[PDB]
Design an enzyme around this catalytic site. Sequence first.
Site, PDB file in Angstrom:
ATOM      1  N   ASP A   1       0.817  -1.214   0.000  1.00 29.38           N
ATOM      2  CA  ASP A   1       0.000   0.000   0.000  1.00 29.38           C
ATOM      3  C   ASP A   1       0.852   1.265   0.000  1.00 29.38           C
ATOM      4  OD1 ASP A   1      -1.242  -2.326   1.474  1.00 29.38           O
ATOM      5  OD2 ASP A   1      -3.048  -1.135   1.118  1.00 29.38           O
ATOM      6  N   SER A   2       1.964   1.234  -0.720  1.00 25.40           N
ATOM      7  CA  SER A   2       2.743   2.431  -0.984  1.00 25.40           C
ATOM      8  C   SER A   2       2.588   2.818  -2.445  1.00 25.40           C
ATOM      9  CB  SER A   2       4.221   2.228  -0.653  1.00 25.40           C
ATOM     10  OG  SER A   2       4.402   2.009   0.727  1.00 25.40           O
TER      11      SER A   2
END
Lengths: 124, 97, 145, 48, 358, 124, 44, 69
Positions: free
Chosen positions: A55-56
Amino acid sequence: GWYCFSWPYRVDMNRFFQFYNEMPLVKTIAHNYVIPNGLNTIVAYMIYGGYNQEDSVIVSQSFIDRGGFAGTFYREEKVELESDIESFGKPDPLITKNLKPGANYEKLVDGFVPVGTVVKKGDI
Amino acid sequence: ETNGLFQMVATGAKGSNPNMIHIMAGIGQIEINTQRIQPQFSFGRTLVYYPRFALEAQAYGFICNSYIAGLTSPEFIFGEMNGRFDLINKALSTSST
Amino acid sequence: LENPKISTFQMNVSACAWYNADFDGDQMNLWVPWSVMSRVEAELLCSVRNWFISTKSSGPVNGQVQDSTVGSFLLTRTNTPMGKNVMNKLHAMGLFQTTQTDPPCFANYSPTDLLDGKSVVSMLLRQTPINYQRAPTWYSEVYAP
Amino acid sequence: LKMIFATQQLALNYVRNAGFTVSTADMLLTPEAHQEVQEIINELLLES
Amino acid sequence: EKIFQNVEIKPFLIDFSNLFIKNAAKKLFQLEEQLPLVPVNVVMDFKGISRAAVHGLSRVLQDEIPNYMLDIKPGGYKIEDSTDLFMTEQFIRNRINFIPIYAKNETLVFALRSLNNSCEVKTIYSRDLIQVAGPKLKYPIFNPTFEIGFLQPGKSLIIEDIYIKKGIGRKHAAFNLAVKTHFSHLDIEQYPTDKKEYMALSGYKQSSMTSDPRHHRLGLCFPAVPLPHINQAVRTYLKNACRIIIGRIQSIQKIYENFEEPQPELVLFSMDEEKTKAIITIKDETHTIGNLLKTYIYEMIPDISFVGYQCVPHKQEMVLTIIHKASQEDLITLLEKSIQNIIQTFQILEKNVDELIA
Amino acid sequence: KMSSRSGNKGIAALALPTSDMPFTEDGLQPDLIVNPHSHPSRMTNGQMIETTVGLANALQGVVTDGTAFLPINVQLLSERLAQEGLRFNGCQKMFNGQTGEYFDAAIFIGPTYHQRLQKFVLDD
Amino acid sequence: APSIMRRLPRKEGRIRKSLLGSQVWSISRSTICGNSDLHLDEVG
Amino acid sequence: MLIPVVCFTCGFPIGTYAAIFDKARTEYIKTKMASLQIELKDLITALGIPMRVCCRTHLITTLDYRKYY
Ligand SMILES: [Mg+2]
Ligand SMILES: [Zn+2]
């Protein structure tokens, strides 16, 4: 995004105003009644060096510099005089009394900081 | 040899076989505590969209459509019940643990 | 990070298994021991190398996650769609650029030599030789028919 | 830990040239396979 | 020799044949012709040169080449008392920054003095940027058709110091010169990618791991060049890119020739198997120079034990490691030969630029 | 923090300049590089379909309504993508920015509405 | 008013807040993010 | 508030032709008015804007502040 159109007149706290917003390329009926807040970013679904794992996101620095998701953030300072003895002014260097170490204390023309002036961490 | 989603699922990088089957083929049966959708709406009605004492499997949470095919309105409502049950359990987790 | 525009705590992705963290907006407290006693204790007792093997389950907590797992699969698979999984000397050399260890010796390879996908892995694993024999997660009987 | 990092870098640097992606067509069933899936679901509905 | 096969330049021109475009242009600028500065899409064919060099030229022309922008001096934005409330200094400075200017002189200074006496929302177009400094503009350095911020009725906007700043597009994107419009290798076959089986592949018939293309077609678009001086501006841009590459490479060569006296940029070890390891650490060096060095070193030393570079996103530096089966003097002489090869390659490229675009 | 309209949050941690950003033979480059691993478990097919539709909308210069429960045919949208000159999928031949080397597999890049969630790192 | 005994129990009480936990100096908090070029035993 | 001076994605100066384009689109919608059935591809390319997904995406979708306040 454009949370309020009268923002310069209001004195808001922790309110962010985003300069650029775009209608979604794939809009929905919910945008017939609210203002879109966000840009139609070109996003590549790919692995690029493993910097977007878990989730970057890897953001284009040029996109950031050009105004993408960049706006202005507003905070305000406000206190009221306790009684007649309290007044707004640059403090009396002669009297001084209980004062603040560091705490630059300059730039307070007529007790306030003039508009357009950068105030650092320690400034008064 | 080239499907990214399948290579993610098969190598164990992310996802599971039920996710792939739901995405492409069909969701199937919705279960809330190992049972179908109970007729909570009324006496014998699971939803306003289905008749009382409905006997078709769709009335009790059977999703014929896959995620890619698009879920209809009652199928989406059943999926939302299942998802909200999952969110409630996740929120219960922190407190009870 | 001497870049003044960066304010986030940066960690390797594989180090998230220690804290059960992800980068969806999580925040983690960090404090630097300043006393001599606490510094000694921190480096000798609380170093994360101690918690590589889980106390709970006696297995390892860390490993490759997501892009590293699928990347290892792509690196070690036998056949790419374009053909055999091989690379020239320059790209096999480039695989080792960012590992930060001592790079291996490619003097035995001409620039036109096609180094296999598994040869480059074996070059790295030679520093810590081990023996392993298991079926991969790639081979599943559900997909097999 | 060092070997985790180094193997991670081999995998990432290989992906840097092999490339990896997921597409909306990776989730798309060919029409004949869609017909097979619908026949399977119709079998389930027939049993019910 | 033939390292720049053939160029082509097509400026992006307004097609007034569309009735709406012409009507709007004549209505709100009274414009009936092409603007003074137009973007041109230059497409370059390079043959007999490695991919690292062509891509390095492309990256330099993208952001690592010096460029000019309009910027406001600290205090240029006048607070006044009746300035527009909505047009903050940040927003207007961002609008002015990314105005693509083709300026040959840095002494020019512009001012934005706009007043909205009327009861309507008056928009400020870039023609309202009056210039009071240095030599008078014989030819404008920007199009007068930009939409700088709008003014509310009764509100003004004064910016008494708009000056031209210099920098590379790597640090601030307002200096970004060339946008990409094409990159391809002409010596690698392509699949018919429309077909289903090749749909999920790149298209080239050679794996990126093994392929070594030497023939490339590079297409860059420049945002603002003067209409009567298109070809000469393109030539200056390309020659300046070659200058930048050559200058950085020559600085690296200076560090190399100063290897006798220990300097922090370059260190040398003596490995236990007679190998000597060369580590070159250079602050604020991008992938361009590192990749050029790696490709050329590996091209001239085929049997090199290891050459690799790593431009970590933090530490803002390029580190190049060279491990070889040669003594320190021999290794240094070889890598200086590689550096001279790079210099020669880009000098030939620049000569081809001079004698090709003409 | 940054998120799409499908509820897929993401912390942006990489500032890649334009030269380092990957690009296509067309010249298109992403603003955000979203990891493909965010999809298979989160199961946000809406983002992928939105990317596919926006790819054709941007070329046609239109804006399409993609409200929920509207009739959706992903096969027909992909056929439309093919008829717009792109591939049947949204994939394109992409070149690594730093090394100038094309990826072996074509990369799915296309427009997608993205929002900046008001959780600024400097604030907290 | 909160008496002496009300100070003790519950999470916000004296025990569970001031004794079993504590506020400290020389500590920083921030949002985490990935960095593929850091060793597993390194933090940015 | 306005159409950006340059395309956010790639920095192509769409802001040059933005001021022509809003008016051109307004006359285009007047000559036909679904709401966004119009294909502005030819209208956009008549201004010199090349076949780039990013530039057209940010040109045809950016919200104008003057049209809302
Ligand atoms: Mg989290
Ligand atoms: Zn663009």
